[PDB]
Amino acid sequence: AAGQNVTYKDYGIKLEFEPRVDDDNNVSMRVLADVSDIDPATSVSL
């Protein structure tokens, strides 16, 4: 609501891995890969 509460946002290199493996060593997986940097151009002063 409203128009306080401070949270935190992560930037950098982030990686998440969730593997599953078969009897023939086949790998079924979900992977999240993120590379994120701060940009001066689109920052707002408030």
Binding site: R20, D22, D23, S28
Partner: protein
């Protein structure tokens, strides 16, 4: 007594996407621009009879 596989090997699909865009524009502004509303004539009369 049979058991299932942990998962099933699925087929893998490759997607290739193309987006193409072209924009063109022309802008011209030429000539002489004059006034269109100008003051006109005036007349006034005034007298004191008494």
């Amino acid at each position: 007594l049979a058991t299932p596989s942990p998962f099933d090997m699925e087929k893998m699909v490759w997607l290739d996407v193309n987006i193409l865009e072209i924009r063109k524009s022309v802008l011209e502004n030429f000539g002489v621009d004059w006034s269109k509303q100008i003051p006109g004539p005036f007349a006034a009369f005034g007298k004191d009879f008494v």
